[PDB]
Design a protein around this ligand. Structure first.
Ligand SMILES: [K+]
Lengths: 263, 215
């Protein structure tokens, strides 16, 4: 299937433009469009827009004035820009492969009959739909044109993995990593304090220690920075061992392996 | 527009559960509704398109239907892993303009209740060397997924500089949360004890740390 990969900044400042890119690789004759959907925390999925092979774009009408979607064939990339962002634009942004089709129909409204279905000609001039009389025959007078109706089809065929974008005035900040210890089973931890943006990764003993590990989702403090903790419970039998918390925060180029000891 | 879905729906295992999605002639009545399943930590998954067609890999117990301006997603035999948010969608006025439903949270009944485990960690020496003190209250293995946390010091409730996360689902289907009390090293030393009291379904589990007796 089509391979979608979002790229762009995970952190932008309010009032700036958020620019994301998707590389969409697959069948070169694919007639799917490439679109963008987002979901802000606690909210519904929200359509942003799409572009197709013909270069035709469509947008969420409510958001259109802030959006620009373009493509660059030479890079196999579709770009999205969201202008003048606020914290309301913090969301996971998903690139998507989208089915888009329109089917158009014509019919004669009630009380009228398609002119070709009338008998005698000229049934009602050359109009589309002749009036039907009470007796149920065509009349020549006051004919109407077809009523045209369109059926629109949209669905997401393939979802990208999404990119979380946070809009914040907080600047990129490296965490301070602290070992946690309590005052037959010993519980150890690490506090990854005051970083920006998400995410951080935490493993124990360079990945060797997985069982009994609980890494908690981050809290956002009033400072505007995140903190998270990880803890591990191990048998008191192993208390003589050396334990380390491996913390990485790619955004600030931080990589720390913190030794954690029972007090 | 936003399609009208019930905020929540519940069912027991093996039961039939249905989620409605009501709109207008200009969206749902257009006759090509799609449905998506969203589970935290995963990208959305397409379930149904064109009112009734199942996407690839989607089990037979999922089916969609539509009657005029109301679409319905039916799960014929509810399974534990069907717990998720479900969103309907439809094009409106154009094939490149899509409106979503408000979303429905589907709970599968019968999960055993479980009290939280609580571990309270005091400030580390290294943090205190920086004149800061964070107390970390880690709360795990609870169900249903809501707790309230109260912090105390020498019998007084603390509200300032407390931040508590929402409850998040663990890999074992129970819930976790954490609460942070951010103090100065001076404030930390100025109290006889601090407590994190976690209340869950009417029951409270309390942990306590005492600065003068902490390492
Ligand atoms: K193409």
């Amino acid at each position: 299937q089509v391979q979608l990969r979002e790229s762009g900044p995970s952190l932008v400042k309010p009032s700036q433009t958020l620019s994301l890119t998707c590389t969409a690789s697959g069948f070169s004759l694919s007639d799917k469009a490439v679109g963008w959907v987002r979901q802000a925390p606690g909210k519904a999925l929200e359509w942003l827009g799409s572009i197709d092979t013909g270069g035709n774009t469509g947008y969420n009408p409510g958001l259109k004035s802030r959006l620009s979607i373009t493509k660059d064939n030479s890079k196999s990339q579709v770009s999205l820009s969201v202008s003048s962002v606020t914290t309301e634009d913090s969301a996971t942004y998903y690139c998507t492969s989208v089915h888009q089709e329109t089917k158009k129909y014509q019919s004669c409204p009630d009380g009228y009959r398609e002119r070709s279905d009338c008998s005698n000609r000229p049934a009602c001039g050359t109009s589309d739909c002749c009036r039907v009389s009470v007796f149920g025959n065509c009349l020549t007078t006051l004919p109407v044109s077809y009523s045209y109706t369109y059926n629109y089809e949209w669905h997401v065929d393939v979802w990208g993995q999404g990119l979380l974008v946070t809009v914040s005035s907080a600047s990129t900040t490296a965490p301070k990593v602290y070992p946690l210890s309590s005052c037959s089973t010993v519980t150890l931890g690490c506090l990854v304090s005051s970083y920006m943006p998400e995410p951080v990764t935490v493993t124990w003993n360079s990945g060797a220690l997985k069982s009994g590990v609980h890494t908690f989702p981050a809290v956002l403090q009033s400072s505007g920075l995140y903190s998270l903790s990880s803890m591990v419970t191990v048998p008191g039998s192993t208390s003589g061992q050396t334990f380390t918390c491996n913390v990485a925060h790619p955004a600030s180029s931080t990589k720390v392996d913190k030794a954690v000891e029972p007090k | 527009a936003v399609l009208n879905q019930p905020s929540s729906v519940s069912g027991s295992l093996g039961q039939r559960v249905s989620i409605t999605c009501s709109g207008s002639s200009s969206n749902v009545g257009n006759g090509y509704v799609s449905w998506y399943q969203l589970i935290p930590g995963s990208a959305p998954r397409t379930l149904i398109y064109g009112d009734t067609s199942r996407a690839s890999g989607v089990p037979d117990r999922f089916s969609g239907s539509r009657s005029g301006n109301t679409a319905t997603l039916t799960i014929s035999s509810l399974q534990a892993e069907d717990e998720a948010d479900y969103f309907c969608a439809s094009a409106e006025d154009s094939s490149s303009n899509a409106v979503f439903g408000s979303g429905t949270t589907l709970t599968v009944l019968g999960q055993p209740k479980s009290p939280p485990s609580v571990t309270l960690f005091p400030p580390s020496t290294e943090e205190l060397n920086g004149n800061k003190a964070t107390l970390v209250c880690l709360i795990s293995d609870f169900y249903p997924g809501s707790v309230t946390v109260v912090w105390k010091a020498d019998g007084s409730t603390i509200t300032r500089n407390v931040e508590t996360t929402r409850a998040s689902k663990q890999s074992n289907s129970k819930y976790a949360a954490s609460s942070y009390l951010s103090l100065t090293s001076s404030d930390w030393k100025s109290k006889g004890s601090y407590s994190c009291e976690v209340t869950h379904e009417g029951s409270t589990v309390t942990k306590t740390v005492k600065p003068s007796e902490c390492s």
